[PDB]
Chain A
Amino acid sequence: EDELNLLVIVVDANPIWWGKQTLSKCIDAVMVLGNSHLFMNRSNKLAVIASHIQESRFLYPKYELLTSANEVIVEEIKDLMTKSDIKGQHTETLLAGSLAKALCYIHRMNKEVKDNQEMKSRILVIKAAEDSALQYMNFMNVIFAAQKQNILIDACVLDSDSGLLQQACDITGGLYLKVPQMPSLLQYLLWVF
């Protein structure tokens, strides 16, 4: 508990979730995981970001805050559901944007913490989507920044093939798991990382 820990969760919003046919369930599970994480230690914090087809957006920004976190997440996702970028209208997601947002937040939190002692942070991606060539430069830029920062990027691929994310974990020294049985999502989040 001595070390402050920030875990940023990037959730891939892509309509691939339709294939998942449930998003509602995925949120419920993610919420349980977050609550546990916050409960483990006082010093744990969480940030949640959505990587949508069109852009990346911040769902939320402590455990005392959890009630707030739950409401903010449910509401934020519902807004996201919009028709544009529907189904595999757009196969990819804006992970690069999400990672950029995550690193900015981690940096800001770190500076404040710098006044104090060191902070440990890691980024978790729940990835539904596929990567694309156009995406390569942007994504890698964020990935390499994280590696230099020594911030591990873990990835849980429910489905699809995001090679870049697999590469991202390797470079970053994070963990990558392609989940067989997506309904076991909760177990993977708790157990896998």
Chain B
Amino acid sequence: RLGMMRHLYVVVDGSRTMEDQDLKPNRLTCTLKLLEYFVEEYFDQNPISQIGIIVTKSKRAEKLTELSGNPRKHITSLKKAVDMTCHGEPSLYNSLSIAMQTLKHMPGHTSREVLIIFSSLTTCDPSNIYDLIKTLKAAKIRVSVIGLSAEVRVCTVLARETGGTYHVILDESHYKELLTHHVSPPPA
């Protein structure tokens, strides 16, 4: 579909809780595998768009792919991540600040988006997260969370305040339905 251009920062939970066997092989394997399927379907639905990839692991944020318009980098990054796995606990504030820094640069008619896959219950960051949520809504950076079996209130407020997309996933079939809803474009 053509009409406008999207910028989306995909954020994945690489904490020790993502190792667990509850969701196929383990959550890390099932999420990266479906996320590869989503990238190719989103870029096919959205030919003029961009994505960037971030992870939170071992109480830090790391850039798996830089912000770009070629899908190939993002499926190659999701392939390369699976081997190095997950350990430790999130860093959501530092991941929303690097994502903010890239998204603030983008011009007037393009969307600003953050997609988070969340299997934790809090985050390790000292900084005041409420100041950063207020700043996302001023900047027009929209944040969505797909949580695994989890409703912990600061994350849910953070996705509502920034635009209205806190979703729960209980199977591999439900996670493919949720990512496929996100493939869908915005109005122009």
Contact = CB atoms under 8 A, between A and B. Distances in A.
A and B touch in their complex, CB below 8 angstroms: yes
A143 B2 CA distance: 10
B163 interface: no
B44 interface: yes
Interface stretch (A49-57, A78-86, A165-173): A165-173
A147 B3 CA distance: 14
A191 to B, nearest CB: 20
B47 interface: yes
Contact of A173 (B2, B3, B45): B45
A140 interface: yes
Interface in B82-125: none
Contacts, number: 18
B153 interface: no
A144 interface: yes
Interface in A119-162: 140, 143-144, 147
Nearest to B41: A173
Interface string B61-75: 000000000000000
A166 B45 CA distance: 10
Contact of B45 (A140, A143, A144, A170): A170
Interface residues of A, number: 9
B13 to A, nearest CB: 29
A167 B46 CA distance: 9
A159 B3 CA distance: 26
Contacts of A140: 2-3
A30 B46 CA distance: 31
Nearest to A139: B2
Interface in B1-28: 1-3
Contacts of B44: 170
A166 B3 CA distance: 15
A181 to B, nearest CB: 24
A143 B3 CA distance: 12
Contacts of A167: 1-2, 47
Contacts of B46: 170
Nearest to A144: B1
Nearest to B1: A171
A187 B151 CA distance: 51
B6 to A, nearest CB: 13
Contacts of A143: 1
A140 B1 CA distance: 8
A169 B3 CA distance: 15
Contacts of A173: 45
A5 B2 CA distance: 28
Contacts of B3: 140
A50 B123 CA distance: 60
Nearest to A174: B44
A167 B48 CA distance: 10
Nearest to A163: B47
Interface of A: 140, 143-144, 147, 166-167, 170-171, 173
17 contacts: A140-B2, A140-B3, A143-B1, A144-B1, A147-B1, A166-B47, A167-B1, A167-B2, A167-B47, A170-B1, A170-B44, A170-B45, A170-B46, A170-B47, A171-B1, A171-B45, A173-B45
Nearest 5 pairs between A and B by C-beta? A171-B1, A170-B44, A167-B2, A167-B47, A170-B47
Given A167-B1, A170-B46, 11 more contacts: A140-B2, A140-B3, A143-B1, A144-B1, A147-B1, A166-B47, A167-B47, A170-B47, A171-B2, A171-B45, A173-B45
